[PDB]
Each structure stands twice: as C-alpha cells, then as structure tokens.
Design an enzyme around this catalytic site. Structure first.
Site, PDB file in Angstrom:
ATOM      1  CE  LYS A   1      13.870 -44.292 -96.571  1.00 37.52           C
ATOM      2  NZ  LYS A   1      12.458 -44.204 -96.101  1.00 37.52           N
TER       3      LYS A   1
ATOM      4  N   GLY B   1      12.322 -47.046 -88.084  1.00 41.80           N
ATOM      5  CA  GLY B   1      11.681 -46.966 -89.387  1.00 41.80           C
ATOM      6  C   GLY B   1      10.176 -47.110 -89.237  1.00 41.80           C
TER       7      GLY B   1
ATOM      8  N   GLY C   1      27.296 -43.079 -89.841  1.00 42.32           N
ATOM      9  CA  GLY C   1      25.986 -42.444 -89.813  1.00 42.32           C
ATOM     10  C   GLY C   1      25.277 -42.429 -91.162  1.00 42.32           C
ATOM     11  CD  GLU C   2      19.677 -42.291 -90.830  1.00 43.97           C
ATOM     12  OE1 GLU C   2      19.310 -41.136 -91.144  1.00 43.97           O
ATOM     13  OE2 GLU C   2      18.918 -43.118 -90.273  1.00 43.97           O
TER      14      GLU C   2
ATOM     15  CD  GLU D   1      15.597 -40.263 -95.331  1.00 39.23           C
ATOM     16  OE1 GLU D   1      16.184 -40.366 -96.430  1.00 39.23           O
ATOM     17  OE2 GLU D   1      14.541 -39.612 -95.181  1.00 39.23           O
ATOM     18  CG  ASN D   2      16.793 -47.011 -96.426  1.00 38.85           C
ATOM     19  OD1 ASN D   2      16.719 -47.090 -95.208  1.00 38.85           O
ATOM     20  ND2 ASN D   2      15.759 -47.235 -97.228  1.00 38.85           N
TER      21      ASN D   2
ATOM     22  CE1 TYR E   1      27.073 -48.289 -85.598  1.00 39.92           C
ATOM     23  CE2 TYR E   1      29.340 -48.386 -84.803  1.00 39.92           C
ATOM     24  CZ  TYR E   1      28.145 -47.696 -84.955  1.00 39.92           C
ATOM     25  OH  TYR E   1      28.024 -46.415 -84.460  1.00 39.92           O
TER      26      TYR E   1
ATOM     27  CG  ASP F   1      15.422 -50.577 -95.295  1.00 38.13           C
ATOM     28  OD1 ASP F   1      14.879 -51.700 -95.281  1.00 38.13           O
ATOM     29  OD2 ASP F   1      14.787 -49.518 -95.174  1.00 38.13           O
TER      30      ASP F   1
ATOM     31  CB  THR G   1      10.511 -42.921 -99.392  1.00 37.56           C
ATOM     32  OG1 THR G   1      10.958 -43.891 -98.450  1.00 37.56           O
ATOM     33  CG2 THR G   1      10.434 -41.582 -98.679  1.00 37.56           C
TER      34      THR G   1
ATOM     35  CG  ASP H   1      12.878 -47.577 -99.026  1.00 39.39           C
ATOM     36  OD1 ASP H   1      12.434 -46.471 -99.422  1.00 39.39           O
ATOM     37  OD2 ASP H   1      12.842 -47.924 -97.825  1.00 39.39           O
TER      38      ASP H   1
ATOM     39  N   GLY I   1      10.028 -51.495 -86.131  1.00 36.06           N
ATOM     40  CA  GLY I   1      11.261 -52.195 -85.826  1.00 36.06           C
ATOM     41  C   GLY I   1      12.399 -51.204 -85.681  1.00 36.06           C
TER      42      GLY I   1
ATOM     43  CG  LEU J   1      23.017 -47.982 -83.994  1.00 36.32           C
ATOM     44  CD1 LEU J   1      23.704 -49.010 -84.870  1.00 36.32           C
ATOM     45  CD2 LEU J   1      23.998 -46.890 -83.586  1.00 36.32           C
ATOM     46  N   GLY J   2      18.742 -46.387 -84.953  1.00 37.95           N
ATOM     47  CA  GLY J   2      17.721 -45.817 -85.811  1.00 37.95           C
ATOM     48  C   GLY J   2      16.434 -46.614 -85.829  1.00 37.95           C
TER      49      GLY J   2
HETATM   50  N1  LIG Z   1      24.341 -51.931 -90.742  1.00 36.11           N
HETATM   51  C1  LIG Z   1      23.992 -50.777 -90.121  1.00 36.11           C
HETATM   52  N2  LIG Z   1      24.973 -50.062 -89.471  1.00 36.11           N
HETATM   53  C2  LIG Z   1      24.660 -48.881 -88.825  1.00 36.11           C
HETATM   54  N3  LIG Z   1      23.446 -48.296 -88.739  1.00 36.11           N
HETATM   55  C3  LIG Z   1      22.466 -49.022 -89.397  1.00 36.11           C
HETATM   56  C4  LIG Z   1      22.648 -50.241 -90.090  1.00 36.11           C
HETATM   57  N4  LIG Z   1      21.452 -50.671 -90.613  1.00 36.11           N
HETATM   58  C5  LIG Z   1      20.589 -49.752 -90.242  1.00 36.11           C
HETATM   59  N5  LIG Z   1      21.120 -48.716 -89.498  1.00 36.11           N
HETATM   60  C6  LIG Z   1      20.281 -47.565 -88.986  1.00 36.11           C
HETATM   61  O1  LIG Z   1      18.956 -48.057 -88.802  1.00 36.11           O
HETATM   62  C7  LIG Z   1      18.001 -47.286 -89.592  1.00 36.11           C
HETATM   63  C8  LIG Z   1      16.889 -48.223 -89.990  1.00 36.11           C
HETATM   64  O2  LIG Z   1      17.385 -49.449 -90.589  1.00 36.11           O
HETATM   65  P1  LIG Z   1      16.548 -49.929 -91.846  1.00 36.11           P
HETATM   66  O3  LIG Z   1      17.047 -51.176 -92.424  1.00 36.11           O
HETATM   67  O4  LIG Z   1      16.444 -48.812 -92.819  1.00 36.11           O
HETATM   68  O5  LIG Z   1      15.131 -50.223 -91.155  1.00 36.11           O
HETATM   69  P2  LIG Z   1      13.651 -49.893 -91.552  1.00 36.11           P
HETATM   70  O6  LIG Z   1      13.259 -50.908 -92.581  1.00 36.11           O
HETATM   71  O7  LIG Z   1      12.800 -49.788 -90.316  1.00 36.11           O
HETATM   72  O8  LIG Z   1      13.755 -48.589 -92.241  1.00 36.11           O
HETATM   73  C9  LIG Z   1      18.865 -46.694 -90.711  1.00 36.11           C
HETATM   74  O9  LIG Z   1      18.266 -45.602 -91.394  1.00 36.11           O
HETATM   75  C10 LIG Z   1      20.159 -46.403 -89.933  1.00 36.11           C
HETATM   76  O10 LIG Z   1      20.229 -45.151 -89.293  1.00 36.11           O
HETATM   77 MG   LIG Z   2      12.774 -50.586 -94.771  1.00 37.98          MG
HETATM   78 MG   LIG Z   3      14.818 -47.561 -93.963  1.00 42.55          MG
END
Ligand SMILES: Nc1ncnc2c1ncn2[C@@H]1O[C@H](COP(=O)(O)OP(=O)(O)O)[C@@H](O)[C@H]1O
Ligand SMILES: [Mg+2]
Ligand SMILES: [Mg+2]
EC number: 2.7.11.11
Lengths: 336, 20
Positions: free
Chosen positions: A154, A38, A112-113, A156-157, A108, A170, A187, A152, A41, A35-36
C-alpha cells in the site's frame, strides 16, 4: 536471471538461519521526531551520536504486541528484514531491545510516503505509475524466490528516496512459507478475495495487491472502497471493477489479469510466473535492468533540504519513550 | 463522479493494517 537470485538466496539463508542480534543500544541515539505511526508502535527520526548519521527507528511496545497477539508476526518481521538485501527494500542497520520495547533501526528515507504525494497530486500519469510498478515487480520477484510473502502492499508502506526511487518498508506481515497460510491480515482495500473467504492462500495475494496499487496510483483512488471495511469486502468478493475513462487499453488489460478473482487465471500465479507481467504490453517500454541498476531518471524527485529534514512527512503528536525498571515478556522475545 | 464519492468517504487518510 535465475543466476542472480540463486546467489542472493545463499546470502538470505545464511542470515535467516543465524540472525544478528543486539547490534546497538538506545543511548547511542538522539531521538528527534516521529515520522509515522501504525496499528501500534511508532517510527522516529534518530541521529546516531558516533557517526552523525540519521536513521528511522521503529519502536514496538512489547506489551501491546502480546495484547494484539502479534508475537510471531513481530518475530518474522525482524528475522526477515535483517536477512534480505535488495535495491528497493529498506535497510535494517541495527536491532536491539530493552525491558519494555523492541527496536529496529533502518536507513532514513527522506522523501516521505508515496501516499502523501499521491493524495496531494491526485494521481500519477501512467508513465509515472509504471516507473513505480516496475520496482515493485522486481521486489516481489526477489521476495517470492525466497519463499517470502509480503502481505501489506500500500502507498503508506512505500517510501520515496532522494533519487525518486521506491523503498519498501514494513515487513510486519512478511512470512516465509512454502505452501499456504491462513492469517487474516493486511489492509482492507488491498485484500485479495481468497484471504477474505478464508480459503488458505499463497504468494498470489501479493500480485493481486500490485493490481490494486497500480490502479490506485493511476486513478487516484482504490478500485474498491466504502466507509466500512465490511462494505469493501463485499465489493472485492464480487470482482466487479470499473476503469476511469483515461486508462489506456493496455493498462486495463494488465489490471483485469491482476485483479482476477480466479487464482488459476491471475497473472503471476501462472506457469510463466512473473514473466507474464514483465512481458505484458503495458511494460513494453520498461528496461528492467536499467531500473534494477537505478539508471533510469526518476519522474519525480522530492524536495530535500539537508540531512535531518522531515518536511516530506506529516507532523504527529510526540510522546515519552517509557522503559520499565522490570523486564517485560523476556521469554517471548528471546530470539529478537 | 467516482473521485468525488471517494473524496467524500471516510477512508481518504492513512489506512491502518488489520489482524482480525
Ligand atoms: N525507513 C524509514 N524511513 C523513513 N520513514 C519510515 C521508515 N520506516 C517507516 N517510516 C514511516 O513510519 C510509518 C510506519 O512504519 P511501518 O513499518 O509501516 O510501521 P507499522 O507496522 O506500525 O505500520 C511509515 O508509513 C512511514 O511514514
Ligand atoms: Mg505493519
Ligand atoms: Mg505500515
């Protein structure tokens, strides 16, 4: 409303003191799609065999964590996430680890973001931006009351759920601290001046970040930007901000108070705390309780096509989940 | 315009967190 926060704190403390551990195992899920990603990880869409439910699994390579010196941060992330409980915070369902990785299984959030919708549409109208802002305000009020700093914020989170509401994910930089901290993290576009200047900072940084967020949502671009981070820092330190001609007088007023370089004047860090924000004119038509109760009709509802649908997320390159036969960094992650 | 300058910049995609 201190009443609510008070009992919520009792819940938090109980879990903060005695965190849950090893509540599931890798073989209980079918890994579906990334799904994404960073700094390191990835997060994968997974399906729980016994229940049939879909979850989002954050996978952390223990070795990379140590290489990047994020041991303490990673431990904060899990410990804090499993203890919090708020309508706009993602839910941690299970957590566990194996010889190679650390796993956090969350609910889940299919929408989306906020990032993708923001970039696609261009910018959000003030009433639309305000809707999201209110949820962040309440979230920060909750987090701070627990002595937590997010660090953090933004697009994206931030995730959009099936009802068009926000889900903050996040907690990688979340930290429980009374007083000040010094880590240079977050960021570039969202860093508060005091962080950049290495002066030691507090919860006030979250409020500055909210300012940057609201600005980005309404404008379609962050208040400070360039091609290289260093160029961005110079602009943030200056405090010189330009507002798009379409910004309302109230929005600009709120923003000048959040993007205040001087901590003694920054909204949220003053005597009245978060109330200076909640009472500001820009939020005049905001029914705080209705938002908390999720009774307000969302201005945007993402297109959802049954469980497991990932059409709201970009595609990423998939890769094998490797599990060594030997245990890596066992001592370092004992409490995880 | 500011929008055009942003869109032409190298930071319009997903931004990574930092830990310098
Ligand atoms: N609970 C969730 N449900 C759906 N998508 C998620 C969820 N958590 C994270 N994501 C996706 O994963 C990406 C990275 O997760 P995140 O916690 O931000 O990891 P990192 O610390 O590597 O940034 C997010 O920007 C998003 O697109
Ligand atoms: Mg992070
Ligand atoms: Mg993140």
């Amino acid at each position: 409303v201190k009443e609510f926060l008070a009992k919520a704190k009792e819940d938090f403390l109980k879990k903060w003191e005695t965190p849950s551990q090893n509540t599931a195992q890798l073989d209980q899920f079918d890994r579906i799609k990334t799904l994404g990603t960073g700094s390191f990880g990835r997060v994968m869409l997974v399906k729980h065999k016994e229940s049939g439910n879909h979850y989002a699994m954050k996978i952390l390579d223990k070795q990379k964590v140590v290489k990047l010196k994020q041991i303490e941060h990673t431990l904060n992330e899990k410990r804090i996430l499993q203890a919090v409980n708020f309508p706009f915070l993602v839910k941690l369902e299970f957590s566990f680890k194996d010889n190679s990785n650390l796993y956090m299984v969350m609910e889940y959030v299919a929408g989306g973001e906020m990032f993708s919708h923001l970039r696609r549409i261009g910018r959000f109208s003030e009433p639309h931006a305000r809707f999201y802002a209110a949820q962040i305000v309440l979230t920060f009020e909750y987090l701070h009351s627990l002595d937590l700093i997010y660090r953090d914020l933004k697009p994206e989170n931030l995730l959009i759920d099936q009802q068009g509401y926000i889900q903050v994910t996040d907690f990688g930089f979340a930290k429980r601290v009374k007083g000040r901290t010094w880590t240079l993290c977050g960021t570039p576009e969202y860093l508060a001046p005091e962080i950049i200047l290495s002066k030691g900072y507090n919860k006030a940084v979250d409020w500055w970040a909210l300012g940057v967020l609201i600005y980005e949502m309404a404008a379609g671009y962050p208040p400070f930007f360039a091609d290289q981070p260093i160029q961005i820092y110079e602009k943030i330190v200056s405090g010189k901000v330009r507002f798009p001609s379409h910004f309302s007088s109230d929005l600009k007023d709120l923003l000048r108070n959040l993007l205040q370089v001087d901590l003694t004047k920054r909204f949220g860090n003053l005597k009245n705390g978060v109330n200076d924000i909640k009472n500001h004119k820009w939020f005049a038509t905001t029914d705080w309780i209705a938002i908390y109760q999720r009774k307000v009709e969302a201005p945007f509802i993402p297109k959802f096509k049954g469980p497991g649908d990932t059409s709201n997320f970009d595609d990423y390159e998939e890769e094998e989940i490797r599990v060594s036969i030997n245990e890596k960094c066992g001592k370092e992650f004992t409490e995880f | 315009t500011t929008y055009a300058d942003f869109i032409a910049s190298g930071r319009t995609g997903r931004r990574a967190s930092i830990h310098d």
